[PDB]
Design a protein around this ligand. Structure first.
Ligand SMILES: [Mg+2]
Ligand SMILES: [Zn+2]
Ligand SMILES: [Zn+2]
Ligand SMILES: [Zn+2]
Lengths: 145, 35, 93, 168, 84, 339, 88, 199, 171, 58
DNA sequence: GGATTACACCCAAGACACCAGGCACGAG
RNA sequence: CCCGGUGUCUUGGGUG
DNA sequence: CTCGTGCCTGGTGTCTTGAATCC
């Protein structure tokens, strides 16, 4: 009621699917590429394009409308940019899992060190929970040197 | 569920074997070596 | 309205009251989601009445949600750490 | 806005390029799959309609509804005034008049004869009725679907269609 | 499919305190938005009071859809459930 | 025994190896081909959050400082440019080894600045940088501080006093509080005459009203409307009237240890500045009148008024499920006197 | 500009002793110029919203850096009432 | 190579030279040949010798050097890349790095003979003496010099279209002013939206 | 290309409409909103089958707002054209850039580089047409074209034809 | 507890949250399947037909 | 090595150092 | 001529 | 008239070494 009318159907959330954002997808939702660390341009206001405060990312000011959605600052959610890295770096949160993956796969071609021919290992792939299965596999393949 | 949680916790907030809160703590934590 | 207050309303079974307190009487916010990819990536111009999730090339399968602003904020902070929280409005099974 | 029985359309790892609508390649998209489901979950063949079937159903539905609007009390220009609104008046009148100038079998006697004659993918069976043809040579060129099916006897089909066809 | 036939309904035939509270509030809300009222209104003109009057005469036109744990459900009309 | 040569496993080296993992082995590793593909754990392009997440604040007047994330993104962006120039020239392994590791460092402490075993990134002021991970954890973070609980509108608080000449389910509410809080009552045929009287009295005379809300959502602020006499109410509009007799409100005294810390009382407007309670409800709240304060919450719709009166009201709470016995009785003076 | 009244300030930007004040009234008017007429921004100090009383005394002086410096003391009287605390 | 405190690289090179010269001909000479520090390589001094022990000797007691045993070896094939030494043609554009014109695009009209300075053509930022009885944060908006405005409000004609106004030269509306070459950026200049509109 | 489709529409009903003829109001409401409208997913919805007997199901009450939500399942005649489909048409306009042919609800544009050279636009003739030997090309002339591309702007569907191919043209 | 660790681990293993808990719906601001929210309320079209005809929607 | 020490409210008092460059003032 | 809002991070003492 | 010398301002920036017990 405090929301202006919109023709899109109103629904509720039934499921939250977590996951990772692919590099391709990050670019697909981005509205601008970010390159220059200087916020201001010539210090004459009017947010220089490509700045950390490029107006395509959104408005936090009552008098400038968003150049992407046309809505005021109250309704405008903000839109993401993207920053290309010259060299790929690790995500700090996932390092101990990355480490676990290295001992599981071949460091040349990347194949799982055990097969369904191994009887105990064939039992471990049946485990329905992904986390426990992954751990059960790694518990076997760890000693495979 | 919630009614059970409050019904057990509220008396604890006003209260040679171990008794009272230190004994209660051993149970919920399921200590392998009780005092 | 702290965590302990929340529990008391559950015990009373007053589910309707608890919803209203934490939304209409506070920081209620409307977002748009894409019916295909489940992200809050929709660009919505309401006076032009045109919507598009550029990633899915989808202008038809789009839903609106009412969620707390602080939840919208939370999801954008998760996106900034490369975590994708996909909001779907139906149970696949 | 308006939705159908088909649901979710969740993303998959391998993309697909047989979605693009191509009547030659029998690609009718996700909504017009070969096996559909009605509003009770029951299985059902896709309902493609020739020009002759469609003229009877639409005209019947409009006059039965018109009679119902009149508490229970022929020409195309009269039948189109049943709709509500000038936008609705336009699309319905243009569809009847278009069908009025391209439907060969304009009555239910001949139409049921064509119905029994035709009643093998369901889409091809409907295509053959809509596009008039003289000989077998003319059918497999404009429509290559028939050649793949390797179906004998297109003469009988065409001969009966042309014989039932009234003069003009 | 999910719906359970009338003769095979198994849930309790008494209105629960939670069902009662939701019915009274929902019906009250509809009356304040000028829904047609099904009982005579005398002196008691509060929205909640009119809804409580309709409940006492078994005249609220609503159906409870009680979900069971597996997702199936029994529809019960408020006209047929016994209110204490 | 043989001499081993441990070399560094750079992110780029590991990145190429991960893209060659087959779909069938991707599944067996517990990953997921559509949602969590294992090479996506390495960062190649960083999503830039909009200004909503990191707003600017004005310390004193015009002066404005930037959010910790804004400063930290500047550092990542500067460090990114120096890899550009350094990779192309003057890169005899050792030089690269210090620049590239520093880009890894800034991207790490941007997300998590509590990495064990190494010094924290610091602001110029000397205090540690507020990373995204630290934004979400702990009592004041996004989850425990803004989502599992949060500050709310239509609330009030003051010192409480007892009153034996109030009914058990009443609460005495100061006039000043009763003029600040409000309830949006929908206009119908049965109350339109009654509600117009409130509109003429205005926001400063009780019983009065503060706003008139149309179906489109435009509020008319009755403090500044000089032609208040020329308003005619239409059905379906809303009038935010003052709190009045018999309205149910939720009353609450911290800390809420059990469900009878929150019961619905009927409001009785009274002079002075304390909340009044009948003396027999002090026990379930574990309240007394030595300085205690209590909180009042006003439901904002027709549905929740009914929920309060039919589920949470004070007479329904006389017997508690904790020990199948009452939690309220005759207490203090009245109990001494009745003996 | 602030929403409260500015009509109790004298021409020197300072309110004078003896004037009763209520909440949100401005008692010290101060402006800051906007960098690149219509060039300044208000930086005034209003009385705390929950208070009232009488301006009692106004100190005017300069600080260690040589700029102007003011203090305004307000007095009111608090009379015991329902809710006030006491103890032996 | 050796890690040193940022900004102290030149000091360390100096200190090494003093130690070398002071010990020449004694029984304990400092057995280094040279030492140097490249600006492009922050916090790193390079030292030439035959034995690692001489490196430790050169740095002993130096308060600007990190005590951790962090001295790294350079490959012969990387020596020349350590000593690499490395436009502004007339009619080209540069960005000014100092003064009220800091950040502004300018055309490099002339270059000083000694080579020390130059002459730049830039869009002025003037007030025509309006409030006289400047900084880069309290400067005026850019606009071409208007000699009739100067005539009206506050001026020496020199030549066709050339005026000296408040001791600066304006020709056909542009300021011509000398800047040190070290005060102008010649590389990687990105014209702005506004500059594309103007020039 | 005509099909029969089983569709459904979410309808929100304000509580003041809760009367004994609720279903009949909804039946009128469904028809007014759906008939004659076009979508890229299904095409033009021409007429809905069995409108006066549609079973609307039960309405879900929206928590917090009082309004009621019906899912009206229904069956309609729909008309969507397809790329590759050969169809007949009636020309609506003739211009230097091609020809126009109303195919029922909409009109398809055929451009000049996909028209054979021997068909020459003749303005001097009365009435204007393309006059080849033993052929008629005037308004209302049966012509046979093939749909080679469908473009949808979510409001209406635009299809481009071609007459260059074998056996296509006037008959 | 272990707030951030849960969520990182949840991402890396693509966890699906079926939104049946009380806490899930509370923080998303939706009516929780408990008490007054443990069921849906439908409109009894059959019961409305016993009303007189002048009450009818047009 | 990490993990934590119940919940809510109010009051008052502090926020960035070092070096290179230009500009203004004083003396010969 | 409508609308109209200003702060963030810590330290110390209380209240219950 | 021309050179020596002190003050204001902006871009830049890091390091001499010096509370306890559950899983
Ligand atoms: Mg007390
Ligand atoms: Zn926007
Ligand atoms: Zn291999
Ligand atoms: Zn999408």
């Amino acid at each position: 009621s405090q929301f202006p009318y919109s023709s899109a159907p109103l629904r509720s959330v039934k499921e939250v699917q977590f996951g990772l954002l692919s590099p391709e997808e990050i670019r697909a939702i981005s509205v601008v590429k970010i390159e220059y660390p200087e916020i201001m341009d010539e210090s004459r206001q009017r947010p220089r394009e490509g700045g950390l405060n490029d107006p395509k990312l959104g408005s936090i000011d009552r008098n400038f409308k968003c150049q992407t959605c046309g809505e005021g600052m109250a309704e405008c959610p903000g839109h993401f940019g993207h920053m290309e890295l010259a060299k790929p770096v690790f995500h700090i949160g996932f390092i101990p899992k990355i480490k676990k993956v290295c001992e599981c796969i071949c460091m040349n071609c990347g194949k799982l060190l055990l097969d369904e021919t191994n009887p105990t290992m064939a039992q471990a792939i049946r485990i329905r929970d992904p986390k426990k299965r992954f751990n059960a596999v790694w518990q076997l393949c760890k000693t495979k040197m | 569920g919630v009614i059970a949680a409050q019904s057990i916790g509220e008396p604890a907030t006003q209260m040679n074997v171990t008794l009272g809160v230190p004994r209660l703590k051993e149970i919920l934590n399921v200590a392998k070596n009780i005092k | 309205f702290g965590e302990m207050e929340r529990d008391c309303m559950i015990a009373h079974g007053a589910a309707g009251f608890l919803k209203e307190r934490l939304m209409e009487a506070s920081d209620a916010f409307r977002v748009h989601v894409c019916g295909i990819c489940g992200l809050m990536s929709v660009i919505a111009n309401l006076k032009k009445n045109q919507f598009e999730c550029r990633s899915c090339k989808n202008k038809t399968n789009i839903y609106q949600l009412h969620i707390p602003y602080a939840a919208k904020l939370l999801f954008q902070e998760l996106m900034a750490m490369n975590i994708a929280p996909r909001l779907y409005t139906e149970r696949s099974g | 806005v308006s939705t159908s029985t088909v649901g979710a359309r969740r993303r998959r790892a391998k993309q697909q390029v047989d979605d693009e609508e191509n009547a030659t390649l029998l690609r009718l998209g996700p909504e017009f799959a070969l096996k559909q489901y009605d509003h009770d979950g029951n299985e059902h063949d896709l309902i493609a309609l020739s020009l002759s079937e469609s003229r009877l159903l639409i005209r019947e539905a409009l006059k039965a509804r018109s009679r119902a609007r009149n508490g229970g009390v022929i020409d195309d220009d009269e039948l189109a005034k049943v709709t509500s609104g000038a936008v609705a008046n336009g699309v319905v009148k243009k569809t009847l008049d278009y069908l009025n100038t391209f439907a060969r079998f304009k009555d239910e006697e001949t139409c049921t004869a064509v119905d029994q004659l035709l009643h093998l993918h369901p889409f091809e069976i409907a295509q053959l009725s809509s596009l008039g043809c003289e000989d077998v040579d003319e059918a497999i060129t404009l429509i290559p679907s028939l050649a793949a099916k390797k179906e004998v006897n297109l003469q009988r089909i065409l001969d009966e269609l042309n014989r039932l066809e009234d003069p003009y | 499919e999910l719906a359970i036939l009338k003769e095979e309904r198994t849930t309790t035939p008494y209105l629960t305190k939670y069902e009662r509270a939701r019915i009274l509030g929902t019906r009250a809300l509809q009356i304040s938005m000028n829904a047609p009222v099904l009982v005579d209104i005398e002196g008691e003109t509060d929205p909640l009071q009119i809804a409580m009057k309709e409940l006492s005469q078994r005249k609220i036109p609503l159906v409870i859809r009680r979900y069971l744990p597996d997702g199936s459900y029994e529809d019960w009309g408020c006209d047929e459930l016994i209110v204490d | 025994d043989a001499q081993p040569e441990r070399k560094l496993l750079t992110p780029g080296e590991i990145l190429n190896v991960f893209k060659h993992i087959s779909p069938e082995d991707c599944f067996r590793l517990g990953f997921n081909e559509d949602y969590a593909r294992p090479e996506w754990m390495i960062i190649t392009v960083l999503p830039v959050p909009p200004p909503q997440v990191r707003p600017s604040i004005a310390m004193d007047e015009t002066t404005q400082g930037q959010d910790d994330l804004t400063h930290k993104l500047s550092d990542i962006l500067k460090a990114n440019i120096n890899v550009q120039k350094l990779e192309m020239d003057g890169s005899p392994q050792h030089i690269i080894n210090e620049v590239e590791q520093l880009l890894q460092f800034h991207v790490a402490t941007y997300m998590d600045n509590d990495i064990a075993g190494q010094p924290q990134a610091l602001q110029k002021s000397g205090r540690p940088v507020k990373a995204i991970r630290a934004r979400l954890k702990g009592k004041e973070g996004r989850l425990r501080g803004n989502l599992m609980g949060k500050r709310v509108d239509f609330s009030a608080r003051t010192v409480i006093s007892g009153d034996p000449n109030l009914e058990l389910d009443q609460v005495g509410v100061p006039i000043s509080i009763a003029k600040t809080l409000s309830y949006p009552e929908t206009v119908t045929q049965y109350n339109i005459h009654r509600l117009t009287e409130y509109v003429r009295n205005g926001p400063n005379e009780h019983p009065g009203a503060k706003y008139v809300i149309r179906d489109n959502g435009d509020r008319i602020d009755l403090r500044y409307h000089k032609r208040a006499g020329d308003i005619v109410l239409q059905y379906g509009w809303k009038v935010e009237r003052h709190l009045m007799d018999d309205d149910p409100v939720l009353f609450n005294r911290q800390p809420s240890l059990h469900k009878m810390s929150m019961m619905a009382h009927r409001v009785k407007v009274m002079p002075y500045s304390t909340f009044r309670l009948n003396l027999s409800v002090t026990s379930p709240y574990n309240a007394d009148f030595d300085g205690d304060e209590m909180n009042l919450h006003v439901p904002q719709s027709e549905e929740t008024r009914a929920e309060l009166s039919q589920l949470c009201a004070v007479p329904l709470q006389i017997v508690s499920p904790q020990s199948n016995k009452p939690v309220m009785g005759i207490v203090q003076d009245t109990l001494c006197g009745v003996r | 500009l602030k929403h409260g009244t500015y009509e109790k300030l004298d021409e020197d930007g300072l309110i004078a002793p003896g004037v009763r004040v209520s909440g949100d009234d401005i008692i010290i008017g101060k402006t800051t110029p906007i960098p690149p007429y219509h060039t300044k921004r208000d930086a005034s100090t209003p009385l705390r919203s929950t208070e009232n009383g009488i301006v009692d005394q106004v100190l005017l002086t300069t600080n260690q850096e040589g700029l102007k410096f003011v203090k305004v003391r307000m007095r009111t009287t608090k009379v015991p009432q329902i809710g006030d605390k006491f103890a032996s | 190579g050796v890690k040193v405190r940022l900004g102290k690289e030149k000091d360390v090179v100096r200190q090494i030279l003093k130690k070398k010269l002071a010990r020449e001909g004694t029984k304990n000479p400092l057995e280094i040949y040279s030492a140097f520090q490249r600006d492009s390589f922050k916090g790193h001094v390079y030292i030439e010798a035959r034995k690692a022990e001489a490196i430790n000797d050169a740095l002993k007691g130096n308060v600007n050097v990190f005590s951790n045993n962090s001295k790294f070896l350079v490959g012969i094939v990387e020596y020349k890349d350590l000593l690499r030494p490395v436009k502004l043609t007339r009619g080209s554009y540069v960005r000014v790095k100092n003064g009220k014109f800091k950040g502004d695009l300018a055309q490099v009209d002339e270059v000083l003979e000694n080579g020390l300075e130059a002459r730049l053509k830039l869009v002025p930022r003037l007030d025509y003496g309006k409030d006289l009885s400047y900084t880069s944060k309290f400067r005026p908006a850019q606009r071409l010099f208007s000699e009739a405005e100067a005539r009206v409000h506050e001026i020496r004609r020199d030549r066709d279209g050339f005026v000296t106004y408040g001791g600066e030269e304006y020709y056909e509306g542009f300021l011509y002013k000398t800047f040190r070459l070290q005060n102008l950026i010649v590389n990687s200049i990105n014209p702005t939206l506004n500059e594309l509109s103007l020039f | 290309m005509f099909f029969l489709k089983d569709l459904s529409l979410i309808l929100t009903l304000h509580p003041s409409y809760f009367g004994p003829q609720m279903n009949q109001y909804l039946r009128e409401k469904l028809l007014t909103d759906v008939e004659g409208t076009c979508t890229g997913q299904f095409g033009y919805i021409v007429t809905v089958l069995d409108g006066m007997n549609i079973d609307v199901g039960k309405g879900r009450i929206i928590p917090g707002s009082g309004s009621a939500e019906f899912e009206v399942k229904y069956r309609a005649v729909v008309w969507k054209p397809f790329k590759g489909e050969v169809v007949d048409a009636i020309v609506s306009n003739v211009s230097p850039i091609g020809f126009f042919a109303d195919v029922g609800p909409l009109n398809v544009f055929v451009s000049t580089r996909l028209i054979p050279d021997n068909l020459v636009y003749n303005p001097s003739n009365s009435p204007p047409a393309y006059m080849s030997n033993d052929e008629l090309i005037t308004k209302g002339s049966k012509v046979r074209l093939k749909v080679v591309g469908t473009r949808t702007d979510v409001n209406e569907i635009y299809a481009i034809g071609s007459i260059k191919e074998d056996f296509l043209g006037a008959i | 507890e272990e707030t951030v660790e849960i969520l990182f681990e949840a991402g890396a293993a693509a966890e699906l949250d079926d939104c049946r808990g009380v806490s899930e719906n509370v923080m998303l601001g939706q009516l929780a399947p408990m008490g007054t929210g443990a069921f849906d309320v439908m409109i009894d079209e059959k019961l409305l037909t016993s009303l007189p005809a002048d009450y009818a929607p047009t």
